[PDB]
Amino acid sequence: QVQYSGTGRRKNAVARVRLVPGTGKITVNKKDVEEYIPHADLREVINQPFGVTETKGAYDVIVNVNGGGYAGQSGAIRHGIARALLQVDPDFRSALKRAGLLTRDARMVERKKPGLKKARKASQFSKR
Amino acid sequence: ARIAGVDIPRDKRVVVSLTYIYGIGNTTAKKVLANVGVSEDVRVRDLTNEQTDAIRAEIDKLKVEGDLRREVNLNIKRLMEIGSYRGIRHRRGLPTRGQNTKNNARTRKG
Amino acid sequence: PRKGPVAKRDVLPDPIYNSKLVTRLINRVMVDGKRGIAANIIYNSFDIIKESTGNDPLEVFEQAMKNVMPVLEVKARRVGGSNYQVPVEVRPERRTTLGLRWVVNYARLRGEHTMEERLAKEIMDAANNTGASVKKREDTHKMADANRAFAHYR
Amino acid sequence: QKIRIRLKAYEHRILDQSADKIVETAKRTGADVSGPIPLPTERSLYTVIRATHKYKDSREQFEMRTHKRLIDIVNPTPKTVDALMKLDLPSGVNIEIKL
Amino acid sequence: AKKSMIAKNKRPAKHSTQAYTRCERCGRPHSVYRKFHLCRICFRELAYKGQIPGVKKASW
Amino acid sequence: SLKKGPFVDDHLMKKVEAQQGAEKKKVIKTWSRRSTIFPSFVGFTIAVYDGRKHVPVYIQEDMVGHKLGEFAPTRTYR
RNA sequence: CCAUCAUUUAGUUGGGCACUCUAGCGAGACUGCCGGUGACAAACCGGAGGAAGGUGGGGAUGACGUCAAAUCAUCAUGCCCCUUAUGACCUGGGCUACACACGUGCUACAAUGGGAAGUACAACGAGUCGCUAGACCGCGAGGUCAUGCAAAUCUCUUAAAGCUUCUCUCAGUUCGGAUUGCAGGCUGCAACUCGCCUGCAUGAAGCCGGAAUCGCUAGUAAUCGCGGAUCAGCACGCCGCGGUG
Numbered sequence: 001q002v003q004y005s006g007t008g009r010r011k012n013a014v015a016r017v018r019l020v021p022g023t024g025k026i027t028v029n030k031k032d033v034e035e036y037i038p039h040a041d042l043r044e045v046i047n048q049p050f051g052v053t054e055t056k057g058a059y060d061v062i063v064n065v066n067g068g069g070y071a072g073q074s075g076a077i078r079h080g081i082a083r084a085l086l087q088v089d090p091d092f093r094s095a096l097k098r099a100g101l102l103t104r105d106a107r108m109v110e111r112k113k114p115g116l117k118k119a120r121k122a123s124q125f126s127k128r
Numbered sequence: 129a130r131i132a133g134v135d136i137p138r139d140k141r142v143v144v145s146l147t148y149i150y151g152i153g154n155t156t157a158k159k160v161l162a163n164v165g166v167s168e169d170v171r172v173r174d175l176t177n178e179q180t181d182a183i184r185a186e187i188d189k190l191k192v193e194g195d196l197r198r199e200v201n202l203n204i205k206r207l208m209e210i211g212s213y214r215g216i217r218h219r220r221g222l223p224t225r226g227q228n229t230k231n232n233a234r235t236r237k238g
Numbered sequence: 239p240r241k242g243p244v245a246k247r248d249v250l251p252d253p254i255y256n257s258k259l260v261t262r263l264i265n266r267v268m269v270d271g272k273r274g275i276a277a278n279i280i281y282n283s284f285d286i287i288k289e290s291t292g293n294d295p296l297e298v299f300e301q302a303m304k305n306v307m308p309v310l311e312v313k314a315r316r317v318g319g320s321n322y323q324v325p326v327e328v329r330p331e332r333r334t335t336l337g338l339r340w341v342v343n344y345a346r347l348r349g350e351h352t353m354e355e356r357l358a359k360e361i362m363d364a365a366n367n368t369g370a371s372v373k374k375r376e377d378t379h380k381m382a383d384a385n386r387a388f389a390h391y392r
Numbered sequence: 393q394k395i396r397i398r399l400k401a402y403e404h405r406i407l408d409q410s411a412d413k414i415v416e417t418a419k420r421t422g423a424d425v426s427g428p429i430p431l432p433t434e435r436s437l438y439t440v441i442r443a444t445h446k447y448k449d450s451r452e453q454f455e456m457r458t459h460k461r462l463i464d465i466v467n468p469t470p471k472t473v474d475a476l477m478k479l480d481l482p483s484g485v486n487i488e489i490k491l
Numbered sequence: 492a493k494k495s496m497i498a499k500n501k502r503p504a505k506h507s508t509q510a511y512t513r514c515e516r517c518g519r520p521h522s523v524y525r526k527f528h529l530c531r532i533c534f535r536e537l538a539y540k541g542q543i544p545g546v547k548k549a550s551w
Numbered sequence: 552s553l554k555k556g557p558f559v560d561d562h563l564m565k566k567v568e569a570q571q572g573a574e575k576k577k578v579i580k581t582w583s584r585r586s587t588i589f590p591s592f593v594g595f596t597i598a599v600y601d602g603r604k605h606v607p608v609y610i611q612e613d614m615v616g617h618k619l620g621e622f623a624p625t626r627t628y629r
Numbered sequence: 630c631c632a633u634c635a636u637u638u639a640g641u642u643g644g645g646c647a648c649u650c651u652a653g654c655g656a657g658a659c660u661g662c663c664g665g666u667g668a669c670a671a672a673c674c675g676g677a678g679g680a681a682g683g684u685g686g687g688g689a690u691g692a693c694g695u696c697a698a699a700u701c702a703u704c705a706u707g708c709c710c711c712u713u714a715u716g717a718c719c720u721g722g723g724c725u726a727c728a729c730a731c732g733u734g735c736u737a738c739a740a741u742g743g744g745a746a747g748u749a750c751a752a753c754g755a756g757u758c759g760c761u762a763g764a765c766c767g768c769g770a771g772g773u774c775a776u777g778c779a780a781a782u783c784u785c786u787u788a789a790a791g792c793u794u795c796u797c798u799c800a801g802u803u804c805g806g807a808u809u810g811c812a813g814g815c816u817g818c819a820a821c822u823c824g825c826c827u828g829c830a831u832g833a834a835g836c837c838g839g840a841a842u843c844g845c846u847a848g849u850a851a852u853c854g855c856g857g858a859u860c861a862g863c864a865c866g867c868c869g870c871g872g873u874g
């Protein structure tokens with residue numbers, strides 16, 4: 001077969017995605033994406049690159065994901081799917097580029113400082 | 129009258145209404161209702177006179193009455209009349225377990 | 239701040255209805271960052287709207303917003319030791335801010351057995367010029383257009 | 393494969409230097425030495441109060457990293473054993489040869 | 492009294508749960524690290540001078 | 552919770568075994584406030600040091616599982 | 630680690646180092662180009678390209694000086710004082726006392742919730758007389774026989790909020806969990822004063838808190854768990870880590 005592979009990262013989670021011609025479906029870690037991320041609607045965040053460019057089918061998606069939480073490792077899946085689509089035809093690097101969908105989100109958990117309750121929350125004060 | 133001691137409430141399931149007798153908590157009600165075979169079904173007490181007598185005769189094998197208050201009362205009574213460090217505290221309205229009395233007596237001394 | 243004006247905090251339009259207003263409404267119901275609960279609440283409320291004497295949840299929601307949002311707000315200020323209040327105009331983003339805020343605040347205080355039975359009912363009562371939200375708007379308009387007295391040269 | 397090394401140290405410079413020493417003097421007399429594979433670099437963390445009597449709300453933090461390195465030898469020879477157990481430099485680096 | 496207590500610390504204890512650690516330079520009994528056997532503020536003093544091998548200032 | 556046999560001290564148990572024969576003396580003066588009241592301590596009069604003095608306590612029967620320190624307090628309030 | 634292959638309970642075993650990962654060495658961000666403003670200047674506003682754009686995000690790094698600020702109790706040390714006692718050894722007791730007043734926190738006053746059953750997803754760290762696999766006994770905290778590991782190999786460690794069903798119905802309550810009675814477990818020579826945990830029973834105040842006052846500008850506030858220093862045992866405190874946002 002022919003296939004297309006990309007790697008997506010977001011917030012302590014890394015995903016390895018594979019594009020394969022088919023009829024439109026995605027399975028992750030040997031389960032169905034309806035069951036793996038059955039939260040409400042994060043799937044409609046995942047299927048956005050197909051919605052903007054290469055509109056819209058048809059590829060079966062196979063991914064291998066590990067790390068982070070359920071909402072991080074779906075933005076990571078989106079990242080990877082977008083990169084793989086870029087790999088198919090390089091002419092997509094404009095429509096995708098306009099709508100984000102191509103950049104890594106570098107918003108990590110800020111580190112805790114000493115003498116503070118959290119990264120920025122301080123203790124309660126009393127002028128007297 | 130009702131099914132033990134006095135006045136198990138209406139309109140609620142038995143697993144909860146049986147809590148209202150002094151000495152029946154939550155797991156005890158479960159075990160009593162299970163040694164017979166009575167369920168809740170559904171959110172009401174619409175029992176039978178065989179189910180009431182069923183769940184009435186078994187409570188007799190426990191200490192769920194003013195037979196329990198006697199036990200607890202005479203226990204604290206034996207405590208305060210030997211030495212006794214615990215009873216001395218029982219006689220002052222002060223925590224009887226070691227509680228570093230700076231605020232922890234608002235419950236124990238009002 | 240002190241340096242000068244700042245940005246506007248772009249929002250991400252929710253994918254169900256593709257409407258940034260529903261996004262802000264989800265963000266206002268949410269407490270403690272539990273967003274899936276807020277989303278379930280808003281979607282059940284809109285299902286309740288359409289199912290019972292409805293046309294579409296976006297339409298009646300926009301009309302309720304239009305009937306609630308204010309157009310004349312006052313600001314209590316200090317001059318030199320005596321404080322008063324004066325009316326002023328109202329820029330657009332503040333308007334929708336206030337609208338959402340009032341609707342959620344006064345649906346939270348309804349007194350039924352579900353946040354949906356409160357939210358759907360309250361924005362329906364709002365799209366028909368009723369409910370403490372509309373009365374709050376009218377209290378505001380009455381405070382203004384009266385306290386213009388000590389505002390006419392402010 | 394019936395011979396393998398392990399090297400720990402606090403400086404990756406000295407670590408890589410000695411790893412190249414052993415790899416070179418191994419493949420000079422034999423063949424097929426698996427590369428100096430890197431291991432995940434343990435780290436510790438020590439927080440301390442930097443004042444002798446009071447002021448808990450100002451501290452100073454220390455650490456101690458420990459770099460790791462792995463080398464496996466394939467098909468030794470009655471000369472590699474000799475030419476290996478003899479070289480010894482340098483001082484503050486741990487060496488542990490297990491068959 | 493801090494010269495008799497270092498002596499009393501080094502003799503074998505009268506019961507299992509009667510031994511306790513002290514610093515080795517000084518005799519400080521509070522906040523000693525038992526990988527180094529050094530107290531809170533001899534550690535910060537010998538870390539500078541680069542005498543303890545390993546330890547250095549951390550930032551990330 | 553010493554379900555592996557309750558706890559007396561040897562000196563205390565030695566003294567009580569030694570007097571177990573006849574009618575007893577009030578001079579059993581021990582510090583030993585950790586010991587429990589075995590069912591043989593009845594009728595005697597133990598002296599329990601409370602950090603300052605030796606308080607005597609007469610051992611009835613209802614006090615048979617408690618400790619010897621529960622009958623000689625140490626704080627002196629009012 | 631498992632994409633192209635056979636295989637089983639499985640990345641396991643044959644195979645491979647493609648991908649992820651680990652960690653050495655390099656690249657990359659400079660108002661560097663393009664338009665306008667402005668004394669043409671510095672600088673500011675907008676665009677292109679790029680993972681990143683204007684000190685990209687965070688840490689370490691604290692001048693001359695101020696408060697005779699703090700510490701002779703970490704350690705040193707000038708002067709003064711004690712010396713059959715202000716030095717030294719032992720048992721038992723305070724340091725935990727309670728008419729009250731002030732500060733810093735935790736748990737709640739419920740339906741955006743309480744209870745029952747099922748299904749998921751992390752990261753930082755620790756381990757030899759230590760971390761305990763597995764099987765069995767106990768309602769439970771735990772116990773017995775035993776197994777791997779001085780560690781990317783084994784273990785601590787199936788995270789909790791989350792999602793899906795079934796209930797309960799606005800009440801001082803199937804909310805809340807203080808206080809007290811009885812029976813146990815674990816460490817320790819020994820848990821009365823004075824430990825932590827388990828089970829059954831009891832079921833307080835509290836229905837969102839005046840004057841006044843605090844924290845915070847984005848993966849931040851709010852909320853949820855996990856680890857370890859100290860340590861036989863003992864954390865609502867402290868230092869870190871990540872999830873939803």
Ligand SMILES: [Zn+2]
Pocket residue numbers: 514515516517518519529530531532533534
């Ligand atoms: Zn020291």
